[PDB]
Amino acid sequence: SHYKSNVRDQVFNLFEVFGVDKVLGADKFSDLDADTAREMLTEIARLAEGPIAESFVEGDRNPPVFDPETHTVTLPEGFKKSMRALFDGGWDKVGLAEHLGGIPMPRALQWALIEHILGANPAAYMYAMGPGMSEIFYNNGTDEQKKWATIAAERGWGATMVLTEPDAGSDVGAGRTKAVQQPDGTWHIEGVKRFITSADSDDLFENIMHLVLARPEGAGPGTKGLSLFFVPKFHFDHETGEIGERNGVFVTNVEHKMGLKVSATCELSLGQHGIPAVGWLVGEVHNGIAQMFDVIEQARMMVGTKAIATLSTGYLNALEYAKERVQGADMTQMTDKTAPRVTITHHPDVRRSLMTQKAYAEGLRAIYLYTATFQDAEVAQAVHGVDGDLAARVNDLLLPIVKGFGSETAYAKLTESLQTLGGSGFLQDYPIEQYIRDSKIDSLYAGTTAIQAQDFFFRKIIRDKGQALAYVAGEIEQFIKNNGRLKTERELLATALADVQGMAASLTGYLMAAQEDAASIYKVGLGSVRFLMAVGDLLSGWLLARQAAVAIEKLDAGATGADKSFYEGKIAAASFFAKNMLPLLTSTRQIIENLDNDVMELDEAAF
């Protein structure tokens, strides 16, 4: 029962802050009303806290075992039981297209539902991403492939995304797996891929769809030469879906990892065992990296939401421990060594720790839900007044924040959650040490933090001509310019916004200088991650302050009891974050304004 959920904060964001209930019961969501959405959140949170979280510890302590002669993994029984509870409730089809058996819903609600599985047992959601992948295959496929995608979604096949090779991780375009065209128009895929999540999954599914990047013989270099292929674990009857003979794609190793142990992470060999790995060209066009980024975009959203979900349950575990742990006297009585003992929430450093965890957990929740409000044209129109084109560019801008800032922040603040338990935090008896191990990977897969920061600056700001960035900046500025009980917070946000504008100007300056001195581009690289984290902090502080403004209205109107306590904590979090996290951005701007290439010119031997 490690998993502590926060449906109340989810509903607060979705309805009281962002107004996603504006679209419920109209247009694409005509059959889903606000009551039902709330019931779904409560239901999956209960299921997550129970049967899904039930095997969280077991998956880590009794991890999958690989049989190299069968090329299969065995998963622990309790975890597979958790997977069946997910399937029996339909929770592998959250947000699936209606024509694939899904329940239409705004993406903001879909990711809030998914947060609970990611908090309780995140590898369970990863194993369950098959139907979502089938929908992406459907969207990119020919008419005939759409029929296969429909079967795969209805039968609940598992799925993988297969990019990485030993020499091609961040540099996808270096991959050497090849595709050999056959006279009948299929392809034979030949190569060894590495680190493939869920490439075998015991007997969870009757089939697995591998979506594989490979280079057709004679194609050009880099990512632009790659094509994407549908490579099923088993051949099947294209009309009925009846499972046929084994296709030539075999797991040949399973990694031993720091955490996320129950997610089998696999070396995957294609066409290496005397049986061809037949692949079908997705959409029967050569457009592999663009097609695969439909998948990567979802994976990056998931990984960021995963890290955020994990910090939230980490914080709530730390809080519940702190409420009960008696240790020491109140600081106002520290010299009286017979003073009454107090619970540790009375100690200033513990309250600082807990409010740091709270503000970042809740600010991050607001960030991913805000990001999701731009993932549906109809939601972005109704709740922001933004047309479909700008909505897509804003969503693309925020994804590296969700992924990069989410992963880095959650892992770092889980350090505070563990510390709150004292020595017991180091014990496996409590879940926080597993939270830390399970979440360290989030800064690495789906593109490292450095790759996120490079995407954010070069593709999502510069190539975008800053239009999404300017949009978000204008919303922040509008909040600042708009009661005076938030006057101090709006002043701190104004400074933080000017700091981030300054960082953006400096980095853009170094880029322009690279027209004359190519090495000036290195300064962009040196500051890129700090810039990404700075924008994340600014967004956290702004969204928390928006939450405080709503909380003030609800308190003024007469909130009582648990509602009152909730709203009071929003005011406290927004004020704490503005006063203790935002000012650091000023020093970070000054640091970025003074970057130089000394560290780039230093001989490698001097390190």
Ligand X SMILES: CCCCCCCCCC(=O)SCCNC(=O)CCNC(=O)[C@H](O)C(C)(C)COP(=O)(O)OP(=O)(O)OC[C@H]1O[C@@H](n2cnc3c(N)ncnc32)[C@H](O)[C@@H]1OP(=O)(O)O
Q: Alpha-carbon distance 339 to 332, whole Å?
A: 10
Report the partner that residue 485 touches, choosing among its own copies, ligand X, ligand FAD, none (CB closer than 5 to 8 A by kind): none
Q: Alpha-carbon distance 77 to 413, whole Å?
A: 32
Report the partner that residue 289 touches, choosing among ligand FAD, ligand X, its own copies, none (CB closer than 5 to 8 A by kind): ligand X
460-465: list long-range contacts, CB under 8 Å, 24+ apart. Answer: 460/393, 460/396, 460/397, 460/399, 460/400, 461/397, 461/504, 462/508, 462/511, 464/393, 464/396, 464/397
Report the partner that residue 126 touches, choosing among ligand FAD, ligand X, its own copies, none (CB closer than 5 to 8 A by kind): ligand X
Using CB under 8 A, pick the residue from 188, 358, 403, 460 that binds its own copies: 358
Contact 591, 562 (CB under 8 A): no
Shortest distance (Å) from residue 226 CB to its own copies: 11
Shortest distance (Å) from residue 540 CB to ligand X: 22
Contact 213, 228 (CB under 8 A): yes
Applying CB under 8 A, does 522 fall inside the site for its own copies? Answer: yes
Beta-bridge partner residues of 208: 158
Contacts of 136 (CB under 8 A, 6+ apart): 211, 294, 295, 298
Report the partner that residue 338 touches, choosing among ligand X, its own copies, ligand FAD, none (CB closer than 5 to 8 A by kind): its own copies
Q: Alpha-carbon distance 512 to 52, whole Å?
A: 51
Beta-bridge partner residues of 285: none
Report the partner that residue 459 touches, choosing among ligand X, ligand FAD, its own copies, none (CB closer than 5 to 8 A by kind): ligand X
Applying CB under 6 A, does 198 fall inside the site for ligand X? Answer: yes
Extract the tokens encoding 122.
């995140």
**Which of these ranges, 56-64, 102-110, 177-185, 441-449, lies near ligand X under the rule CB under 6 A?**
441-449
Binding track, positions 431-450, relative to its own copies; x by CB under 8 A: --x--xx--xx-xxx--xxx
For 528, how many CA atoms within 13 A lie in the half-sphere containing its CB? 24
Helix (H, G, I), strand (E, B) or coil at 214: strand
Binding track, positions 291-320, relative to ligand X; x by CB under 6 A: --x--xx-x---x-----------------
Contact 187, 229 (CB under 8 A): yes
Shortest distance (Å) from residue 179 CB to its own copies: 19
Check residue 245 and report its DSSP letter.
E
Applying CB under 6 A, does 536 fall inside the site for ligand X? Answer: no
| CB-CB neighbours of 174 under 10 Å | 14
Helix (H, G, I), strand (E, B) or coil at 95: coil
Please list every residue from 78 through 137 that binds its own copies, using CB under 8 A: none
Applying CB under 8 A, does 605 fall inside the site for its own copies? Answer: yes
Between residues 308 and 545, which has the closer beta carbon with respect to ligand X?
308
Closest CB to ligand FAD belongs to which residue?
A: 169
Helices (H), 102-244: 107-120, 122-127, 130-140, 143-155
Between residues 264 and 372, which has the closer beta carbon with respect to ligand FAD?
264
Shortest distance (Å) from residue 35 CB to its own copies: 27
Report the partner that residue 87 touches, choosing among ligand FAD, ligand X, its own copies, none (CB closer than 5 to 8 A by kind): none
Q: How far is CA 331 from CA 104, 144, 340, 342, in A?
A: 54, 71, 11, 10
Contact 570, 603 (CB under 8 A): no
Residue where the block lists tokens 């090495």:
519
Applying CB under 8 A, does 350 fall inside the site for its own copies? Answer: yes
Please list every residue from 452 through 471 that binds ligand X, using CB under 6 A: 455, 459
CA dihedral 388, 369, 459, 228 (to 10 degrees): -80
Shortest distance (Å) from residue 103 CB to its own copies: 34
Residue where the block lists tokens 């109704």:
382
Extract the tokens encoding 72.
């299969």
Report the partner that residue 196 touches, choosing among its own copies, ligand FAD, ligand X, none (CB closer than 5 to 8 A by kind): ligand FAD
Applying CB under 8 A, does 566 fall inside the site for its own copies? Answer: yes
Applying CB under 8 A, does 349 fall inside the site for its own copies? Answer: yes
Using CB under 8 A, pick the residue from 34, 513, 514, 555 that binds its own copies: 514
Between residues 1 and 424, which has the closer beta carbon with respect to ligand X?
424
**CA triple 361-422-118, angle to 5 deg:** 35
Shortest distance (Å) from residue 581 CB to its own copies: 9
Beta-bridge partner residues of 280: 230
Shortest distance (Å) from residue 598 CB to ligand X: 26
Contact 134, 157 (CB under 8 A): yes
Using CB under 8 A, pick the residue from 1, 27, 35, 221 that binds its own copies: 221
Applying CB under 8 A, does 426 fall inside the site for its own copies? Answer: yes
Among 127, 124, 119, residue whose Cα is nearest residue 45: 119
Q: Alpha-carbon distance 216 to 225, whole Å?
A: 8
Which residues are at the interface with ligand FAD (CB under 6 A)? 160-164, 169-170, 195-197, 257, 260, 265, 325, 327-328, 344, 347, 349-350, 419-420, 422-424, 426, 441, 444-448, 450-451
Q: Alpha-carbon distance 189 to 433, whole Å?
A: 41
Contact 162, 211 (CB under 8 A): yes
Report the partner that residue 528 touches, choosing among ligand FAD, ligand X, its own copies, none (CB closer than 5 to 8 A by kind): its own copies
Using CB under 8 A, pick the residue from 195, 236, 368, 531 that binds its own copies: 195
Question: How many residues make contact with ligand X (CB under 6 A)?
Answer: 29
Please list every residue from 156 through 195 that binds ligand X, using CB under 6 A: 159-161, 163-164, 170, 172-173
Applying CB under 8 A, does 523 fall inside the site for its own copies? Answer: yes
Between residues 342 and 555, which has the closer beta carbon with respect to ligand FAD?
342
The residues binding ligand X (CB under 6 A) are 126, 129, 133, 159-161, 163-164, 170, 172-173, 197-198, 222-223, 289-290, 293, 296-297, 299, 303, 337, 445-447, 451, 455, 459
